[PDB]
């Protein structure tokens, strides 16, 4: 079931939730862009995972989530095994984000099949990054990791560097990061740690506005050169120009704007 950018009157969330309850064979639920209803977001979340479900992918992107909707999901994650994809990305949580995120992090210990996960954006996931990474080390099958939009520091990227040390992931192909804070120390703070992850297909490492240190551009070029796929890099928010593109090695493309 795909319900992409469908405008709703909020109240119908109940009727839709009731419809979903009868779809006992559902495997893929993608919703996405469910306007901005606010009220009822929990009805969609509640209807799923309530009563043992066999869903393999649950994608709720830009649908407007709240700390309560996230807590409700986490509370019901006692079943829903064989779930592999769980996103809930691009749904900023204005308040109580920490409580909802902590409840989620403390779970996902029965969902053995989870991989290529993204986290809810909200205030303030940074405080639980260390806990997340420690738990991600428990699942070598991780293919992708989404830590988008929220503000990072020069110390958070060093923690990620340590995470990518590391006991081999092998199949980690994508890194999603729609926002960061970078300087003359970072990416250089961790750059080179990804030379051990040559299977990478793409990554964002995005920021707001920063012109890369010549040392970083030269190192980046070598890091990119040694990758196996690199099927279109995205490095958005970086002030790269013709001089850096000359230094940067051959690649399918690099999106910097």
Curated annotation (Swiss-Prot):
Domain of life of the native organism: Eukaryota
Where found in the cell? Answer: Cytoplasm; Cytoplasm, Cytosol; Inflammasome
Where does tissue-level expression of this protein occur? Isoform 2 is expressed ubiquitously, although highly expressed in lung and spleen. Isoform 1 is highly expressed in lung, followed by leukocytes especially monocytes, lymph node, colon, brain, prostate, placenta, spleen, bone marrow and fetal liver. Isoform 4 is only detected in brain.
User: Which regions does the record annotate with the repeat LRR?
Assistant: 1-18, 20-45, 57-80, 81-103, 111-135, 144-166, 169-196, 198-218, 232-254
Q: How is it modified after translation?
A: Phosphorylation is essential for NLRC4 inflammasome function to promote caspase-1 activation and pyroptosis.
Q: How does it assemble?
A: Homooligomer; homooligomerizes to induce formation of the NLRC4 inflammasome. Homooligomerizes following activation by pathogenic proteins. Component of the NLRC4 inflammasome, at least composed of NLRC4 and caspase-1 (CASP1). Some NLRC4 inflammasomes contain PYCARD/ASC, while some others directly contact and activate CASP1. Interacts (via CARD domain) with PYCARD/ASC, pro-caspase-1 (CASP1), NOD2, BCL10 and NALP1 (NAC) by CARD-CARD interaction. Interacts with EIF2AK2/PKR.
- This protein's domain notes: In an autoinhibited form the C-terminal leucine-rich repeat (LRR) domain is positioned to sterically occlude one side of the NBD domain and consequently sequester NLRC4 in a monomeric state. An ADP-mediated interaction between the NBD and the WHD also contributes to the autoinhibition.
Main role? Key component of inflammasomes that indirectly senses specific proteins from pathogenic bacteria and fungi and responds by assembling an inflammasome complex that promotes caspase-1 activation, cytokine production and macrophage pyroptosis. The NLRC4 inflammasome is activated as part of the innate immune response to a range of intracellular bacteria.
UniProt disease link: Autoinflammation with infantile enterocolitis: An autosomal dominant disorder characterized by neonatal-onset enterocolitis, periodic fever, and fatal or near-fatal episodes of autoinflammation. Affected individuals tend to have poor overall growth and gastrointestinal symptoms in infancy, recurrent febrile episodes with splenomegaly, and sometimes hematologic disturbances, arthralgias, or myalgias.
The name on file for this protein is NLR family CARD domain-containing protein 4
Kindly list the organism's lineage.
Answer: Eukaryota, Metazoa, Chordata, Craniata, Vertebrata
